[PDB]
Design a protein around this ligand. Structure first.
Ligand SMILES: COc1c(F)c(F)c(C(=O)N[C@H]2[C@@H](O)[C@@H](CO)O[C@@H](S[C@@H]3O[C@H](CO)[C@H](O)[C@H](NC(=O)c4c(F)c(F)c(OC)c(F)c4F)[C@H]3O)[C@@H]2O)c(F)c1F
Length: 138
């Protein structure tokens, strides 16, 4: 397994047709997972499954600019389960990040950070065993 938190450099940032795949297993009794696509200190795309927010499961997505979080986008479809292996695929498209979990479309997140070629790091954190994190162009 890879160390968590894990930093995956994205050389030259992201670009449409780049597919980022995260394989891992959720820990028992998980509380949260986070993916943070970073442009320097900014977070262009934060993808945050929360396993117990007031006894509900939700995926929170947002952007952090100058240390301020913006308006959240919430998705109640929640494909993760404690103890189970998952695959997260993030496909960069011209207008949004497109996320599929376990081969099923989950959500899209419109680009708020415009300089895609400066989104040069992905941090992977939270209550997972991380197997692999990689990218390819499709
Ligand atoms: C792996 O471990 C970590 C992790 F996974 C993380 F995500 C984080 C992290 O930075 N999390 C922050 C990040 O996820 C951020 C994204 O917006 O949200 C905060 S918590 C956040 O705190 C805000 C106030 O400071 C608000 O309370 C946020 N809630 C809402 O905007 C919100 C709400 F409160 C209503 F009641 C709504 O009901 C309709 C609603 F829609 C809301 F969006 C509430 O979601 C989290 O603390 C972290 F630090 C970790 F260490």
């Amino acid at each position: 397994p890879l160390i968590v938190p894990y930093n995956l450099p994205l050389p030259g940032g992201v670009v449409p047709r780049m597919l980022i795949t995260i394989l891992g297993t959720v820990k028992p009794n998980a509380n949260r997972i986070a993916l943070d696509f970073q442009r320097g200190n900014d977070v262009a795309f934060h993808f945050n499954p929360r396993f117990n927010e007031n006894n509900r499961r939700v995926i929170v997505c947002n952007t952090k600019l100058d240390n301020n979080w913006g308006r959240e986008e919430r998705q109640s479809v929640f494909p993760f389960e404690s103890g189970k292996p998952f695959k997260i695929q993030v496909l960069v498209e011209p207008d949004h990040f497109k996320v599929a979990v376990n081969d099923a479309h989950l959500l899209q997140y419109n680009h708020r950070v415009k300089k895609l070629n400066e989104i040069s790091k992905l941090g992977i954190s939270g209550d997972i065993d991380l197997t692999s994190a990689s990218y390819t162009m499709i």
